[PDB]
Amino acid sequence: QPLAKDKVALLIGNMNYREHPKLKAPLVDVYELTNLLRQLDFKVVSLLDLTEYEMRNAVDEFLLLLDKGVYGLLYYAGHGYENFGNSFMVPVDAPNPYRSENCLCVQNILKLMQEKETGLNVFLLDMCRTANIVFGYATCQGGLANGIFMKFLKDRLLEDKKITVLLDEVAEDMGKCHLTKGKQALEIRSSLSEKRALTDPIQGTEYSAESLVRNLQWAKAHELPESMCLKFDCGVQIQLGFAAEFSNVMIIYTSIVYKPPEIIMCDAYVTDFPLDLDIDPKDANKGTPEETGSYLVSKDLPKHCLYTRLSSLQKLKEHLVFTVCLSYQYSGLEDTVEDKQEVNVGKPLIAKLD
Amino acid sequence: DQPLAKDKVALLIGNMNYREHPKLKAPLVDVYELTNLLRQLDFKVVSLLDLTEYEMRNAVDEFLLLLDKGVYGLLYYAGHGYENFGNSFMVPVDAPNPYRSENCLCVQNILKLMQEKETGLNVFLLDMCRTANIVFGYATCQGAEAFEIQHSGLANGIFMKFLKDRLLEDKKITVLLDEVAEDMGKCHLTKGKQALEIRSSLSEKRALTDPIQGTEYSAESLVRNLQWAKAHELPESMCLKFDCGVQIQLGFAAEFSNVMIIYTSIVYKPPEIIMCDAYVTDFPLDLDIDPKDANKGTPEETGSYLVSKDLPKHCLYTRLSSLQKLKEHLVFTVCLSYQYSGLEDTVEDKQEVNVGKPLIAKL
Ligand SMILES: CO[C@@H](C)c1c(Nc2ccc([C@H](N(C)C(=O)C3CCS(=O)(=O)CC3)C(F)(F)F)cc2)cnc2cc(Cl)nn12
Ligand SMILES: CO[C@@H](C)c1c(Nc2ccc([C@H](N(C)C(=O)C3CCS(=O)(=O)CC3)C(F)(F)F)cc2)cnc2cc(Cl)nn12
């Protein structure tokens, strides 16, 4: 029975390009793929909208996890560039027109992967135009629907079959669909000489330094701040919540859980976020998570709160410090009272790394 | 439902006799055996040994013109190869030492031309020594180290030994090749001697065993049949009669599309004649036939080990390789040295023969 020493996955979805058309599918697809891989016991890091420097750092750190026998999976969705026989992943800060030096060369990553003694290394490119390496290269021409590749991949990914056979079925499913024939293509390259599957069990978990390094890094990237009850001088109590949508996207939500009898009406809101997050106050404190651009973790969030989506957590170099304001009017009075409390929740999710 | 092929054509090239590089042995057996397995799957096959740059570019370009809509193509190359700047190359027998890209055939350039075809299935197999529905098998093996114990020259190469055991399966070509890759992985002898990468954009259930689409007489179909029929035309057997009464039969067999075996035998000898030798000579200079290799008592003495079994026995054999170099009619002389009963004098006679342009030279 083939076994994995560990299962690690890096998933990058680029959508909000500074000088190129915006994509919608990577958001839904990276989130879908993250939960499918968690079902197969992968430790996953999922990141949205990365610059060149961020993507190069993420890919280099992912490659350091590929110790002998480890199963790796690198998925990229976004703009892709093809030039002089090479393909390139396009970061969100790419100039117009594309230049090689600003993008990540796919063949350079494949060359770095061939140097590893991984039990399985899957590299999937879902682009808009022995190492045991399986490379899938999906290409399509330029609301919450999946992209073509993920629509077919998600319905086969949990199969207990050799990864090459399973990807071959995905390519055949696409060729049997009229939507794909003149819109989407799939190319698979493989030097897999053994029976290896994403479903293969992880080997009897020892506590070696090598395995502890891999678990530590992943554990940091998943650290959410604990829920907080803020107590104000006037008696008002605000509950503060934190949810992870991606490794670099966190949803914050607030609710006035206790309002004293003597206070007619009160409003709470979050403000003064670190400037490196670039939070537009007009997109914060929404009555629904969907209004923040958060449509995936929405269902699993408490109701009747105010929501703020904190994306770009990878850009935070300091502690996440922000303010909770309170505007309350006393009974039988004509004054609006303001009071604020600073909150330091440390370095959440991917910002926990350094 | 059952996928169909409009037609099935294959071009197999095996380079062994390098001018400035080491000689290989496995392409001879591998190209011969793969030809016979493909014929069993109803492919029209062209098999060529030892091609120069010019010959290879012509063979590949002419095979690419056969790839009409719905056609199943297979290109197989065995010989020296090299990878330079992400591109791989097929080395022709006239390539200088060291390799120069302009003298070699770029594999990526060929794959690009295949992409422009509406083929039902396009299979490109490289067995090198170091929409289109394309399936590309890139096999690379370690060049034989100087002190390694060599085995028989009639042994299969590593890739073909594994491929021949799966090739006839009625299974999707990508799955079949994936099983070949896995068979090589289980064999620990191949761990550092043979590698195999499979690249595929096949989007349908295509197999080499798919039946050919209800055989027609269209112009486009007849064009592929005609070119292939020309490359398989052998001269018919001849009976040469000499003044002395002796009759000599001259026979012809094909080993490869560019290798023909000629054989002579005495079919009638008058009782008054005792000694009687027939031998072939005056071959076109372009073929470069060494007379020391001609007129042998066994096919194996000419370097012919594959069609030997199907050749008539008790003949004199001559192997004519490099038929692709023949630029005019294959004209040669059949000599007769004989002796009458009771006489010490050896009498001589000869007859010139024109057998047209055989096999690949018929193009
Ligand atoms: C080994 O670590 C774990 C968590 C890890 C990865 N590491 C990783 C991911 C993203 C980044 C980038 N970061 C923070 C910067 O580039 C920073 C560098 C320091 S800085 O001050 O410039 C802030 C930006 C990005 F993409 F988020 F931006 C860097 C490292 C990658 N894949 C996996 C898969 C699994 Cl499982 N674990 N894993
Ligand atoms: C469409 O035709 C058929 C027979 C055909 C091919 N054609 C083909 C064409 C040229 C050559 C070369 N030739 C003669 C020259 O290069 C000559 C060029 C003119 S010349 O006078 O210089 C002598 C050499 C070589 F390789 F033999 F050398 C070899 C093969 C190729 N693949 C297939 C597969 C199937 Cl099925 N049919 N098929």
Burial code (b: 16+ CB inside 10 Å, e: under 16) for A314-351 equals: bbbeeebebebbbebebeeeeeeeeeeeebebebbbbb
Q: Which residue has the tokens 């303010």?
A: A323
A44 lies within 8 A of chain B by CB: no
User: What's the rounded Cα separation, in Å, for the pair B298 and B360?
Assistant: 25
Give the separation between CA B178 and CA B171, rounded to whole angstroms: 11
The CA distances from residue B68 to A2, B9, B38, B117, B136, in Å, are 44, 11, 19, 7, 19
Residue to mutate among B203, B205, B206, with most A CBs inside 10 A, is: B203
- Which strand ranges, in their side-by-side order, compose the sheet holding A306-310? A228-231, A237-246, A249-258, A306-310
* Cα A196 from chain centroid (whole Å): 26
Residue B22 near residue B153, CB atoms below 8 Å: no
Domain boundaries, given as residue ranges, for chain A: 1-218, 219-354
By Cβ distance, the residue of B87, B197, B204 closest to A190 is B197
Distance CA B18, CA B90 (A): 12
CA atoms within 13 A on the CB side of A66: 28
* A244: nearest Cα among A145, A144, A313, A154: A313
Give yes or no for B36 touching A (CB within 8 A). Answer: no
User: Resolution of the coordinates in A?
Assistant: 2.1
Q: Element (H or E) spanning A124, and its range?
A: strand A120-128
Q: DSSP string covering B67-101, please?
A: --TT-EEEEEEEEEEEEETTEEEEPPTT--SS--G
B224-229 — which CB contacts under 8 Å span 24+ positions?
B224/B7, B224/B9, B224/B44, B224/B66, B224/B68, B224/B71, B225/B44, B227/B62, B227/B66, B227/B363, B228/B9, B228/B44, B228/B46
**Crossing angle of helices A106-114 and A52-63, rounded to 10°:** 10
Residue B331's CB is within 10 A of a number of other CB atoms, namely 13
DSSP classification of residue A3: -
Which residues, other chains included, contact B346 with Cβ-Cβ below 8 Å and sequence gap of 6+? B275, B337, B338, B339
Give Cβ neighbours of residue B95 (< 8 Å, ≥ 6 apart).
Answer: B18, B19, B20, B21, B53, B80, B103, B104
| 3-class DSSP string for B134-177 | EEEEEEEECCCCCCCCCCCCCCCCHHHHHHCCCCCCCCCHHHHH
Q: Does A185 touch chain B (CB under 8 A)?
A: yes
**Ramachandran area for residue B44 (φ above 0: left; ψ -120 to 50: alpha; else beta):** beta
- From CA A130, how far away is CA A120, in angstroms rounded? 9
The angle formed by the CA atoms of residues B208, B211 and B212, to the nearest 5 degrees, is 105
Active-site annotation holder among A20, A103, A128, A140:
A128
Integer Cα distance of A264 and A196 in angstroms:
65
Q: How far is the CA of B363 from the centre of ligand 2 (A)?
A: 7
| Collapsed DSSP state (helix, strand, coil) of residue A162 | coil
Do A186 and B201 make contact, defined as CB atoms within 8 angstroms?
A: yes
Strands, E, within chain B: which ranges?
8-14, 44-49, 72-84, 87-90, 105-106, 121-129, 134-141, 194-200, 238-241, 247-256, 259-268, 273-281, 316-320, 331-340, 347-354
Q: What is the bridge-based pairing of β-strands A86-89 and B331-340?
A: unpaired
What are the C-alpha distances in Å from B355 to residues A21, B240, B247, B336, B352?
Answer: 68, 13, 18, 19, 10
Closest C-alpha to ligand 2, atom 37: B228
How many other β-carbons are positioned within 10 Å of the β-carbon of residue A46?
25
Q: Which ligand is nearest to the CA of B93?
A: 2
Alpha-carbon distance of A44 to A351, in angstroms, equals 16
